[PDB]
Amino acid sequence: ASVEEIRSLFKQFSSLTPREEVGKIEDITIPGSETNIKARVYYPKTQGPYGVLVYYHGGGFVLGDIESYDPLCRAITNSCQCVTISVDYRLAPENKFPAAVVDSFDALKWVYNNSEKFNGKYGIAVGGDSAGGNLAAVTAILSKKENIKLKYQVLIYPAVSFDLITKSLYDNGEGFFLTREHIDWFGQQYLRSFADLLDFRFSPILADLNDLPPALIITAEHDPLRDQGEAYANKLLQSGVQVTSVKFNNVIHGFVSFFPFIEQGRDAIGLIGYVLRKVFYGK
Amino acid sequence: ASVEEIRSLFKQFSSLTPREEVGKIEDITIPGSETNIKARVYYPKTQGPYGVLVYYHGGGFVLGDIESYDPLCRAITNSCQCVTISVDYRLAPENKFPAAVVDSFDALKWVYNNSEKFNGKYGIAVGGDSAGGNLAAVTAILSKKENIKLKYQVLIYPAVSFDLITKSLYDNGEGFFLTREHIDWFGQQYLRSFADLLDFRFSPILADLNDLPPALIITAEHDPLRDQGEAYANKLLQSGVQVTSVKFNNVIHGFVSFFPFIEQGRDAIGLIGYVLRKVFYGK
């Protein structure tokens, strides 16, 4: 299948997944430094003021979009009882690294600077799954540098490093949905050159992680990315940041997207909701 | 320290913990088959009807009690928004196996038969930590035998088998609070003879686990009991029971007890809260 055909398939498959009712939805355009960035704003059914979660979909920097991730964002919104803003960052191979990063940070900054539009008085968090988790993590690093004070970061089986060595990569690199071959191909679509492997904006493990927001990092047992996700948690802890690092057993990469039929996914969404309600509201 | 001093040391240190407000608290005495069993009933701040969680404290079958667990049970009550009933089962060595089991099951049957007294229309779950997780699991197995239909079981780093073989026992058997020497000593206090090692009421991994209530099983990375907790999850899964099995990284056996200081414990309490709100209330 072509890239376009797979992008379309993501949207089609999403229409089989129930979309929970939320309080209100609005589609907005965020004025980026390089592009006008579409985003979808979900309000919860409770009354404000709110926290705001800026969410970055996964898809290997190539696939996914606001629509295919609409069911998941609705579910997160109801779980966190918080405004969720799902960001349509530019994709590769049309838009190489660091386009996705530039859009993700620009959106965060604009949300942070415009939070009153959303009655977002309880502050701003970032979160994302897989490649989206990568973008959340990188956006939190970039925020530190600009004195943007985030509340939290929710990293759902994030990609944090180029990896040829972890035991989970070899144990789990075939037979469990996301394969070695996929990982290679996504990296080829996204990166410009081998030198980008030295860039913390691609591998955030490289960065100094002092003074970042407290994190919930979810990994999955049968996931080639498992060990590097746990490494990121450990390096955050070593750098004095509070992190809850949880491995969900018996499930594969992507399981949170399959919450309607993988119950552990629903429970991960419950846990995500709890930590954000705690950090935003005190509970 | 005698058994008495070791008990009093745990009470003392628990006595200094802020207790979360709950709705209301009632102490009751349940007419057991072998003894009168004190239980503390915690109501959430919401109104009913409720689900009911019957909770069994940890402490290696030798320590702990309603008072020393009172802060944890309050925190759980508020998290699950459910009536929580903390059971004062008989302790060893004064009362050998299977005294704890008899009391734990006797309490459960009585609660199940008297659920209207608590406005407990949404059904009954069991839960517990460590030795108490053992008791919860064994209670669910005994309940199945007598056609008592439970909604859920929450097993927090449960003891499920006599163990001389797991990797986690050897990796984590010293230096992480719960040591080989403690495991040995608790078993010596609790059991009557080596024959008791064959009894599923001490090692619930021995039982047929078909048709048991869906489970949340939490394990801790640096815990000698980690692998056998995961084995219980996997054996339940093999037996067609839905289970969410989650390993909390970077923490030790007992971490949920330390929730005021160890933030991962607070987050574990959030997850327990979510799964029970889900199964009782659809929330």
Three-state secondary structure string covering A261-281: CCHHHHHHHHHHHHHHHHHHH
Question: Do A148 and A108 form a contact (C-beta atoms < 8 A)?
Answer: yes
Work out the angle between the directed axes of helices A263-281 and B263-281 (0-180°, nearest 10).
120
Distance CA A149, CA A156 (A): 21
User: How many Å is the Cα radius of gyration of chain B?
Assistant: 17
Task: Say whether the peptide bond before residue A204 is cis (omega within 30 degrees of 0).
Answer: no
Closest CA to B63 of B189, B176, B168, B163: B189
Question: Do A216 and A154 form a contact (C-beta atoms < 8 A)?
Answer: yes
Q: Is B172 strand, coil or helix?
A: helix
From the candidates A14, A130, A245, A257, give the one annotated as an active-site residue.
A130
Question: Do A193 and A162 form a contact (C-beta atoms < 8 A)?
Answer: no
- At CA A185, angle to CA A181 and CA A191, rounded to 5? 145
Residue type present at position A176: F
Closest CA to A228 of A155, A148, A127: A155
From the candidates B14, B68, B86, B130, give the one annotated as an active-site residue.
B130
Distance CA B240, CA B238 (A): 6
CB contact (8 A) between residue A248 and residue B250 = no
Closest CA to B22 of B50, B53, B43, B52: B43
Distance CA B275, CA B283 (A): 9
The DSSP code for B240 is T
Q: Is B136 strand, coil or helix?
A: helix
Q: What is the dihedral of CA B130, B136, B137, B142, to 10 degrees?
A: 150
- Residue B216: list chain A partners with CB under 8 A: 267
- Residue B75: list chain A partners with CB under 8 A: none
Distance CA A12, CA A18 (A): 13
Question: Do B263 and B250 form a contact (C-beta atoms < 8 A)?
Answer: no
Is the alpha carbon torsion for B45, B114, B214, B85 positive or negative? positive
CB contact (8 A) between residue A274 and residue B275 = no
Closest CA to B59 of B87, B20, B17, B18: B87
Distance CA B230, CA B240 (A): 15
* Experimental resolution (Å): 1.7
Domain borders along chain A are: 1-283
Tokens of A242: 């509070």
Closest CA to A116 of A48, A32, A204, A30: A48
B1-283 belongs to CATH 3.40.50.1820: yes
Beta-carbon count within 10 A of A180 CB: 14
**CA distances from residue B264 to A136, A151, B269 in whole angstroms, order as listed:** 21, 17, 9
Report the structure determination method: X-ray
Closest CA to A96 of A34, A152, A182: A34
Distance CA B221, CA B248 (A): 6
Strands B243-252 and B36-43: unpaired
Q: What is the DSSP string of chain A?
A: --HHHHHHHHHHHHTTS-----SEEEEEEEE-SSSEEEEEEEE-SS-S---EEEEE--STTTS--TTTTHHHHHHHHHHHTSEEEEE----TTTS-TTHHHHHHHHHHHHHHHTGGGGT-TT-EEEEEETHHHHHHHHHHHHHHHTT---SEEEEES---S--S--HHHHHHSSSSSS-HHHHHHHHHHH-SSGGGGG-TTT-GGGS--TTPPPEEEEEEEE-TTHHHHHHHHHHHHHTT--EEEEEEEEEETTGGGGTTT-HHHHHHHHHHHHHHHHHHH--
Distance CA A50, CA A43 (A): 9
């009536």: which residue's tokens?
A: B83
Active site residue B14: no
- Residue B80: list chain A partners with CB under 8 A: none
CB contact (8 A) between residue A243 and residue B250 = yes
SS3 content of chain B, % helix, strand, coil (to 5): 40, 20, 40
CB contact (8 A) between residue B233 and residue A250 = yes
Sort B116 into a burial class: Cβ within 10 Å, 0-12 / 13-18 / 19+. Answer: exposed
Residues 6+ apart with CB under 8 A from B75: B20, B259, B266, B269
Distance CA B7, CA B67 (A): 11
CB contact (8 A) between residue A245 and residue B250 = yes
From the candidates A65, A70, A223, A227, give the one annotated as an active-site residue.
A223
Active site residue A184: no
Question: Do A64 and A10 form a contact (C-beta atoms < 8 A)?
Answer: yes
